[PDB]
Ligand SMILES: [Ca+2]
Ligand SMILES: [Ca+2]
Ligand SMILES: [Ca+2]
Ligand SMILES: [Ca+2]
Ligand SMILES: [Ca+2]
Ligand SMILES: [Ca+2]
Ligand SMILES: [Ca+2]
Ligand SMILES: [Ca+2]
Ligand SMILES: [Ca+2]
Ligand SMILES: [Ca+2]
Ligand SMILES: [Ca+2]
Ligand SMILES: [Ca+2]
Ligand SMILES: [Ca+2]
Ligand SMILES: [Ca+2]
């Protein structure tokens with residue numbers, strides 16, 4: 359019943375106020391392991407497992423299942439952990455069973471070309487599907503985001519997101535953004551570990567330092583440079599989150615800035631930038647590097663934070679028109 363009508367992916371015809379893909383009628387926000395799946399809709403309630411992998415579909419996610427394929431051979435001794443193979447046949451004796459030698463998760467996409475080799479639910483990128491989420495559908499300081507298609511955001515808008523469909527535990531995420539205009543000097547970036555419109559990590563880059571023109575609800579000063587922040591809003595999309603996202607630092611009950619480039623180097627107009635992000639939920643590892651061609655423009659260095667155990671990936675925009683995103687790529691890094 360719940361794991362049938364609750365998920366927006368099973369029935370999109372319902373409300374989902376916090377944009378976490380769980381219908382309002384079922385949403386209770388109880389998530390003890392903070393992996394983005396509430397307790398009663400988590401196949402491993404106490405073990406962090408954001409992608410909810412369950413290869414034998416027995417109700418116990420791989421993360422809390424001792425025999426992920428139910429073939430009687432425990433994971434630790436199974437030479438084909440995700441493919442049933444009782445005889446453990448291994449004709450060349452390399453420790454990998456014949457049953458899964460070319461396609462470990464049996465999603466019909468060989469290991470080498472499979473971006474998520476140990477996840478039957480993901481085999482290729484599908485960033486052809488975006489969920490647009492306005493970060494301030496309350497205030498009207500500026501018009502909300504407008505997206506078109508090269509995914510472009512055309513308005514000097516209020517903050518907003520464009521988030522993908524796939525969910526990840528450990529992941530490497532890369533992409534390209536281009537500001538096709540010399541007008542303005544604000545924000546462009548991306549998100550990862552996205553769970554709800556009140557829960558996600560965000561990486562943003564501003565061109566020139568500037569204080570947000572509306573001192574309400576809180577004073578916000580955004581410095582030029584790359585920043586890494588974690589959002590845990592007590593209010594959700596609105597004016598409070600708005601100013602907090604802009605502020606280079608911490609805003610009570612809204613945002614925490616984990617790192618900011620000490621050099622405050624802003625992005626350049628009409629320049630293609632490539633970002634490379636690595637997130638390892640198990641240890642809380644986070645690192646983002648920005649590139650201008652083959653040149654390194656910014657490097658966050660190792661950052662550690664375990665607020666969120668995983669989630670979706672997406673694009674971020676805040677008061678910057680003509681932001682062109684393209685060539686998005688991602689790969690799972692599990693275990
Ligand atoms: Ca919801
Ligand atoms: Ca929720
Ligand atoms: Ca959970
Ligand atoms: Ca879990
Ligand atoms: Ca299972
Ligand atoms: Ca397991
Ligand atoms: Ca099992
Ligand atoms: Ca097994
Ligand atoms: Ca097996
Ligand atoms: Ca073998
Ligand atoms: Ca595969
Ligand atoms: Ca796969
Ligand atoms: Ca608005
Ligand atoms: Ca500019």
Ligand SMILES: [Ca+2]
Nearest residue numbers: 542543544568
């Ligand atoms: Ca500006």
Ligand SMILES: [Ca+2]
Nearest residue numbers: 514544677678
């Ligand atoms: Ca602006």
